[model samples]
Target: MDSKTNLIVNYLPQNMTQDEFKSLFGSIGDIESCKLVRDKITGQSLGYGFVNYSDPNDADKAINTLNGLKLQTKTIKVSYARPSSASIRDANLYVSGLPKTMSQKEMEQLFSQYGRIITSRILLDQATGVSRGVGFIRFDKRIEAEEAIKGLNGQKPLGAAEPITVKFANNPSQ
Candidate 1:
């Protein structure tokens, strides 16, 4: 597997186009690809996108320069994209309210019963070296992912205070 050096930009303006998004990142680094995620049904922005840089250093530079910077209506969240099986972007879940103590393998162990987990991850805060309390899971099948959501959404992770919230992933990965 290659490094998931790609960046995930959140809270994008609904009107941001691929060209504009590419251009924004292009100014900071050599963009291998940039895509604004859209609603498959409504066809509007999901307010997020993925930007891949040819160099990890360049991607890191963009994160330092642009993460939390204001863009249009909201300040965007920027960070490294999570890794998963190739083309596993479509049927994934975004989970929150996770206990910071959880690790990727633990997350996999927790969710695997629903189906074959393509990838399971917990994001971390770069500077503080702490869990971001958010993560993602990609499953081999859409039905399996939905099953996880149906069974887990209202339940708390083993050590969490609030019930974990699970929803379809908004990030678009290649």
Candidate 2:
């Protein structure tokens, strides 16, 4: 459970492209994937991304060697991208601030814009079945989950009173 083979790099230059990112990090080792999250509507860079290496050694090297390194005028933040479960446990990403009237289907629809949803649930009051303004969503993959977290976190839905807190869920049974 201590694997450190993936990294979440933040504060990247807004202009950096996927090829440049791959080239810079490829020296460390075999890159399984490199994704630069972008706006779904505008297609603008979000200034963050995840890089997955084939082995932990390479990931560690990148973290130690590239952290704080200037990439096109930005000092990047590099750290082990915790597993989705850990992100959920730490409240780094989890659903909150939902409307009491929101349902599981509504939650799924809101998050489906980022990626395929595996499952979604909204906790409800037992007696009235009213929403508690909290929920959990599972994505088809960790990358999708991370993208959803970045895309939806702190975003206020249309007509909603507060911003939504979207993050990966901790429950493995999902």
Candidate 3:
């Protein structure tokens, strides 16, 4: 799932300078910050960038209007950015061994006891669109995530072949 205020812009023109990139998105609304990934040594554009809006609603407007728009004959993609490392530190949980039959709605229901769910998704196979038995759930608070891990880790759910694994989605030591 995407963050509320940040956007990841992909397939940017390789030759587009940072200022031009910012200028394109800046027209959409007030940008809190903008960045283009570049090679450290060669300083070449990596064909992707990030934009953050101080107002979350601005991000939605940017995505709705900018996504799939062709720029320099190359289609650019704009979508919600994944949670930044700072935000994912302790509120996201990695779940594995989930029953492939479990739907996203069901997963949310299962974890609803732990906390208020901000976002949840199950990994799926691109070709066949089948569940991969892995999922992620983000809680509104770190303590709620902690409670989920403690309560659900290694517990086997109904219709599961093995005990489920639950842990913090990211390493805090990083």
* lDDT (0 to 1) per candidate: 0.74, 0.69, 0.75
Question: Top model by lDDT, which number?
Answer: 3
Ranking by TM-score: 3, 1, 2
Residue lDDT tens for model 1, 1-174: 565766788767766677787777677766777755667787645567888777888888778888788745667767776664545455678888777686888888888877778678888775845646788887877777887788887865668677668778765474
Give the winner by lDDT: 1 or 3: 3
RMSD of each: 8.2, 13.6, 8.2
Which has the better TM-score: candidate 1, or candidate 2? 1
The TM-scores, one per candidate, come to: 0.48, 0.44, 0.53
User: Compared with the true structure, what per-residue lDDT tens digits does model 2 show for residues 3-71?
Assistant: 466588877777777788778777777888876666688865557777877777777777887788864
Across 54-146, the per-residue lDDT of candidate 3 in tens digits comes to 877777877888888875568898777666544442367888877657698888888876777877878868574554678888787777788
| Selected candidate, larger TM-score, 1 vs 3 | 3
User: Which one wins by TM-score: 2 or 3?
Assistant: 3
